Amino acid sequence: DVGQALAFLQQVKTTQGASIYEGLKAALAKVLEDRPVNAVEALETSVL
Amino acid sequence: LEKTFALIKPDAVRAGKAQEIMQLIELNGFTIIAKQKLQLTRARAEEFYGEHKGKEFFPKLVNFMTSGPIWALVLAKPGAILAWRALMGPTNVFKARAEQPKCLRALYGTDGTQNATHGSDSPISAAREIKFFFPTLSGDPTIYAEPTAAAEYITKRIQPALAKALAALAREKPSADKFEAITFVAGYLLQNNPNKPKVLM
Amino acid sequence: LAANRSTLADKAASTAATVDAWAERQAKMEAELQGKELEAVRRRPTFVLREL
Amino acid sequence: VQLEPNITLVLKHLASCGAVVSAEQQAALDHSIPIKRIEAGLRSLTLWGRLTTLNGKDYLVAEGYNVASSKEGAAVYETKYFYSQDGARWSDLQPVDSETATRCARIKGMLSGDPAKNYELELVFQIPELAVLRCRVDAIATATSVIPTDSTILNAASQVVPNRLFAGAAYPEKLESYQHRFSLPGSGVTLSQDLRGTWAVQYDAFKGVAQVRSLLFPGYFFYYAANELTWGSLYVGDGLRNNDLIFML
Amino acid sequence: VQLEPNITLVLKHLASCGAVVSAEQQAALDHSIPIKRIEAGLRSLTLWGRLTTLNGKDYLVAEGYNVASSKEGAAVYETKYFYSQDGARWSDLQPVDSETATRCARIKGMLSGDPAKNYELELVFQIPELAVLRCRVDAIATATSVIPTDSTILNAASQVVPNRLFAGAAYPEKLESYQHRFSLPGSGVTLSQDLRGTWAVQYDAFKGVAQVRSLLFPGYFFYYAANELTWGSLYVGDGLRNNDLIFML
């Protein structure tokens, strides 16, 4: 179930020091707090 | 979180009151996930209003909605359907002015049928109208993913042409490479299908 | 994001507290200096009379 | 988008509203604002307004500030004011006390041009003219200082900085698009939580330019150009608010 | 940090270089730029320059692009060009095929006024004057079109978009700080990679305004203010090329 995916996404690490789960969470937090102009393209251009 | 359909009629657009309505909508907690200004034709309007189909008011109703551009919105809110029904207020404009003032129908709507807004009644009609006006807006992942309903939809879709495509692929047996088989079956499907015709120059 | 707001507010409060602590330490030092000066002024006549 | 308001843009968009400056003063500002800006450590320094006088030597007032912090639930911009009779030389505009400002409030009519005058109030009190000018300027600045909503944003160390990803104020012909600078960016307090009839807004949708005029202080004007995403405010006239406003509406 | 260069700041910062327009034409531009921008469905439309004719009726030329994408290592902008004798009404400049695009570079001398003029070249070839004007504008745009480096960035789907977080160019005096428009953001191609002595930069450190003039095309100027990040360019004068660069320097 979702528990398997959650447990898996926290062991996988990315090029950055944090896990992919934490990286996505931080990216979403920045997007939600900043509210960029063209947000979807700002994800690939500004937040990550 | 549920999504409802809404539309701003030409009477609130010919008077340049669309942006005020949008700001009021955003002020009450709604979120406009999709908006589009468009202009229905007679056939499209008649297809949209299929539930009436020959009632007393239908001629004037379809003649009014095709008199100018309207706006189509998809609003998102936890109680979106009921909250938007309340926000619009009563359907009849004079009854609206009498009972509930400071409602969008009381303020911008006038003269009966020109109530300046239109909303969805139930989630069935909401989803139907959203798919009618926004064919590519994703939604409702729970009412389509039932194993029974998934099998039923696959049954409705596969007997017409996919089974014949698979039979042709098996009989012809093209290159064992899967990419050529994929291309051939895609060509067969896009060439033989009951829904669309065959196009020739 | 809620936690981020809280942490930012806490950090700003910490810096303000540091500034206020420096100001009060300076005030206390100045007060002690004034006390020492007043004590010396009071002490001087006896010193110049009987301890030169 | 813009980092600082541009003087020529302000004079160009407020030309209709009657907020104008003379040619000599315009050129002198162009050549002299940077000099005074760099003489101090101010990151920003711009023309604030032009108060009218009796002899004919109008008071040009400019204001500047270095950094914009948030403190006690508000944006506290530490500002410094300068005045002049000609655009060339800028002199400091000293801040006044509290009781001196209360006495300031009782002087009416346009103040004279000479900054060496003294007004007599009542036991008698002597009020310098520069004190009156500073009192009026701070009153107007406190009352009305418009920036488009969410054009600024907080950051690390909690300093109110510009918001380089500002999308543009949606529905800019309404007062919910503009806010006082002192109001914090996150908060929903805007130009609509003050009195119902002390702000007027005109809007040209094709050119996309909005003009906000203060009716409490009939000399305060503001523009917001949406296509260029540039905003700016000016004051022209004597620092008197019309208390008889209700009969005017 | 800007998204499109103003038409007022360009005329203000380039006034000294003689890059000026008549006041009546300036008001007409202010009115009729948005009209043509909406009539043509272009998200960006700015004044590109002004070319001199044998009459007083100079050609005002404005360029505007709707899409701008990376293509074979070139940032291709799908530009459209419009011309006008007066600031009021604009006409279009249709592109030129290669045969006449090579038979138009041999025609020299400053153009006439009526855009219905036929030059005759050597059997005789008849070439319209509008073709010659288009050729000259294309040559100047290829040789000169200049923007600060890192002011554009590449997003998904390979489109060049303004860099909203452009913090400005350090060392604005250096030519390395500036690049052509059709250079990809990743590539380290600048104006330094051009001929050594074809670009003159004069930078006022105090006011923070750098000015880049083209010596190969003498009438092209580009200003860049760094205190507020604002860059613009204009071409004023005839479109002819300066062949003998070696002797002059």
Which chains have at least 3 CB atom pairs separated by less than 8 Å from chain A? Answer: C, D, E
Nearest to D87 by CA among D31, D7, D28: D28
**SS3 label, residue B8:** strand
Nearest to A37 by CA among E164, E80, B52: E164
Nearest to E235 by CA among E24, E36, E49: E49
Question: What does the block give as tokens for D121?
Answer: 């109030």
- Which amino acid, one-letter code, is at D34? P
- In order, the DSSP letters of E196-228 are TTSEEEEEETTTTEEEEEESSSTTEEEEEETTT
Look at D34 and E4 and tell me if their CB atoms are within 8 Å.
Answer: no
Question: What does the block give as tokens for D66?
Answer: 């270095």
Does any CB of chain C come closer than 8 Å to the CB of residue D55? no
Nearest to E198 by CA among E243, E159, E235: E243
- The CATH code that applies to domain B2-133 is 3.30.70.141
Nearest to D245 by CA among D198, D175, D196, D191: D198
- DSSP summary character for residue B177: S
Which of E6, E164, E165 lies nearest to residue D228, judging by beta carbons?
E6
Nearest to D91 by CA among D123, D60, D137: D60
Helices A20-34 + A2-9 axis angle, to 10: 90
Does any CB of chain A come closer than 8 Å to the CB of residue D166? yes
- DSSP summary character for residue E177: G
Nearest to E226 by CA among E162, E150, E173: E173
Q: Is there a contact between A13 and A24 (Cβ–Cβ < 8 Å)?
A: no
**Which stretches within chain E are classed as H helix?**
7-13, 23-39, 98-103, 129-144, 245-248
Residue E245 neighbours by CB under 8 Å, 6+ apart = E195, E197, E198, E215, E216
Chain D interface mutation, best of A32, A34, A40, highest count of D Cβ atoms under 10 Å: A34
Q: How far is CA D197 from the centre of its chain?
A: 20
Does B14 count as an annotated binding residue?
no
Q: Is there a contact between B45 and B52 (Cβ–Cβ < 8 Å)?
A: no
Strand partners, A20: none
- N residues, chain D: 249
Q: What is the dihedral of CA C12, E228, E2, D228, to 10 degrees?
A: 100
* Chains D and A physically touch (3 or more Cβ atom pairs below 8 Å): yes
**SS3 label, residue D6:** coil
- DSSP summary character for residue A46: I
- Which amino acid, one-letter code, is at D210? A
> Alpha-carbon distance D8 to D30, whole Å?
9
Method of determination is cryo-EM
Does B9 count as an annotated binding residue?
yes
Residue B167 neighbours by CB under 8 Å, 6+ apart = none
φ and ψ at residue C31, rounded to 5 degrees:
-65, -45
- In order, the DSSP letters of B95-151 are HHHHH--SSHHHHT--STT--SEEE-SSHHHHHHHHHHH-TT----SSSS--HHHHH
* Chains E and A physically touch (3 or more Cβ atom pairs below 8 Å): yes
Does B91 count as an annotated binding residue?
yes
Question: What does the block give as tokens for B29?
Answer: 């907690």
Look at D174 and B22 and tell me if their CB atoms are within 8 Å.
Answer: no
Exposure b/e, D95-134, CB count within 10 A at least 16 = b: ebeeebbebbeebeeebebebeeebeeeeeeebbbbbbbb
Element (H, E) at C8: helix C2-50
B96: Cα within 13 Å, side-chain hemisphere? 25
Minimal-distance CA residue of chain D relative to A36: D165
Residues of C in contact with A29 (CB under 8 A): 1, 4
Q: Is B29 left (phi over 0), alpha (psi -120 to 50) or beta?
A: left
Q: Is there a contact between A26 and A19 (Cβ–Cβ < 8 Å)?
A: no
Q: Is there a contact between D150 and D178 (Cβ–Cβ < 8 Å)?
A: no
- In order, the DSSP letters of D20-86 are ---HHHHHHHHHHHHHHHHHTT-SEEEEEEEE--SSS--EEEEEEEEEEEE-SSSEEEEEEEEEESS
φ and ψ at residue D133, rounded to 5 degrees:
-60, -45
**β pairing state of B31-38 and B2-8:** unpaired
**SS3 label, residue E98:** helix
Question: What does the block give as tokens for D209?
Answer: 């330019």
Element (H, E) at C15: helix C2-50
What is the edge-to-edge ordering of all strands in the sheet holding B31-38? B31-38, B70-77, B2-8, B117-119
φ and ψ at residue D47, rounded to 5 degrees:
-65, 130
> Alpha-carbon distance B107 to B24, whole Å?
12
Q: Is there a contact between B81 and B123 (Cβ–Cβ < 8 Å)?
A: yes
**Other Cβ atoms closer than 10 A to E171:** 10
Which of E155, E164, E165 lies nearest to residue A44, judging by beta carbons?
E155
> Alpha-carbon distance B186 to B198, whole Å?
15
Angle CA A37–A42–A46, to nearest 5: 120
The label of the residue with tokens 């002595």 reads E197
**SS3 label, residue D51:** strand
> Alpha-carbon distance B33 to C50, whole Å?
94
Chain D interface mutation, best of C6, C8, C18, highest count of D Cβ atoms under 10 Å: C8
Angle CA E190–E193–E194, to nearest 5: 105
φ and ψ at residue B190, rounded to 5 degrees:
-70, -10
Q: How far is CA D85 from the centre of its chain?
A: 18
**SS3 label, residue C9:** helix
**SS3 label, residue D196:** coil
Look at E228 and D165 and tell me if their CB atoms are within 8 Å.
Answer: no
Which chains have at least 3 CB atom pairs separated by less than 8 Å from chain D? Answer: A, B, C, E
Does any CB of chain C come closer than 8 Å to the CB of residue D154? yes
> Alpha-carbon distance E187 to E175, whole Å?
16
> Alpha-carbon distance A44 to A24, whole Å?
12
Burial class, D144, CB count within 10 angstroms (exposed 0-12 / middle 13-18 / buried 19+): buried
The set of long-range contacts for E104-111, using a CB threshold of 8 Å and a minimum separation of 24, is E104/E131, E104/E132, E104/E134, E104/E135, E105/E135, E105/E139, E107/E132, E108/E240, E109/E240, E110/E52, E110/E53, E110/E54, E110/E238, E110/E240, E111/E51, E111/E52, E111/E53, E111/E54, E111/E59, E111/E238, E111/E239
**Torsion sign, CA atoms B144, B146, B151, B155:** negative
> Alpha-carbon distance D49 to D144, whole Å?
13
φ and ψ at residue B165, rounded to 5 degrees:
-65, -45
φ and ψ at residue D90, rounded to 5 degrees:
-110, 125
- N residues, chain A: 48
In chain B, which ranges are E strands? 2-8, 31-38, 70-77, 117-119
Q: Is B23 left (phi over 0), alpha (psi -120 to 50) or beta?
A: alpha
First to last CA, chain A: 29
Does B28 count as an annotated binding residue?
no
> Alpha-carbon distance E32 to E89, whole Å?
7
Residue E131 neighbours by CB under 8 Å, 6+ apart = E96, E100, E104
* Chains E and D physically touch (3 or more Cβ atom pairs below 8 Å): yes
**SS3 label, residue E30:** helix
Does B60 count as an annotated binding residue?
no
Distance from CA of D174 to the nearest CA of B (A): 9
- Which amino acid, one-letter code, is at D97? D
Burial class, E59, CB count within 10 angstroms (exposed 0-12 / middle 13-18 / buried 19+): buried
Nearest to B4 by CA among B109, B138, B121, B92: B121
Does any CB of chain C come closer than 8 Å to the CB of residue D158? yes
> Alpha-carbon distance D111 to D122, whole Å?
18
Q: What is the dihedral of CA D208, D209, D214, D220, to 10 degrees?
A: 160
Give the active site residues of B: 118
Residues of A in contact with D153 (CB under 8 A): 34
> Alpha-carbon distance B143 to D217, whole Å?
60
Residues of D in contact with E9 (CB under 8 A): 6, 8-9
> Alpha-carbon distance D226 to D208, whole Å?
6
Question: What does the block give as tokens for B122?
Answer: 């139930």
> Alpha-carbon distance A3 to A5, whole Å?
5
Q: What is the dihedral of CA D144, D147, D148, D154, to 10 degrees?
A: -120
Does B117 count as an annotated binding residue?
no
Chain A positions with Cβ closer than 8 Å to E: 37, 41, 44-46
> Alpha-carbon distance E181 to E194, whole Å?
14
Residues of C in contact with A32 (CB under 8 A): 1
Nearest to B40 by CA among B18, B19, B9, B16: B9
